[PDB]
């Protein structure tokens, strides 16, 4: 377990833990999911929490979040659901993630970064050189380190 992996868990946790109190509530979970275009009910959010709420206090703490990531990621992402994620980034749905669209989802999520950092990410994934990220490029980027 590296400090960078820990830093990554922390970053992810803090995208949900908006008030920084060390627990993720239904309110906070819902906030993230709404920003990504979904509309779960309060009861549905509670059911999500209950799956990993090992201490039974009704909210997600750091290790319970790690468990959620352990399970609910590397399920076995199929074609269709990878396309769903792409669609989140391709805001206008023209088939090409622009730097501006990438910036927008990241900001909506709660990430804070300069247009410089966004451009860097784009250029990293832009295999064919048009300054944008298409579906194939997006899929390929996720296989790299």
């Amino acid at each position: 377990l590296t400090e960078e992996q820990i830093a990554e868990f922390k970053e992810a946790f803090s995208l949900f833990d908006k008030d920084g109190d060390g627990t993720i509530t239904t309110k906070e979970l819902g906030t993230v999911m709404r920003s990504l275009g979904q509309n779960p009910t309060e009861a549905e959010l509670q059911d999500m929490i209950n799956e990993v709420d090992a201490d039974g206090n009704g909210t997600i703490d750091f290790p319970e979040f790690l468990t959620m990531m352990a399970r609910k990621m590397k399920d076995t992402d199929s074609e269709e659901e990878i396309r769903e994620a792409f669609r989140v980034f391709d805001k206008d749905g023209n088939g090409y993630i622009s730097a501006a669209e990438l910036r927008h989802v990241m900001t909506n999520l709660g990430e804070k970064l300069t247009d410089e950092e966004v451009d860097e990410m784009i250029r990293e994934a832009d295999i064919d050189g048009d300054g944008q990220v298409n579906y194939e490029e997006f899929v390929q980027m996720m296989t790299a380190k």
Partner: peptide
């Protein structure tokens, strides 16, 4: 680090949670 992979991960998680 893996900025896009981390964010992708969060988007894929959220998609997975709305089962």
């Amino acid at each position: 680090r893996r900025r896009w992979k981390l964010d992708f991960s969060i988007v894929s998680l959220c998609n997975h949670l709305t089962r």
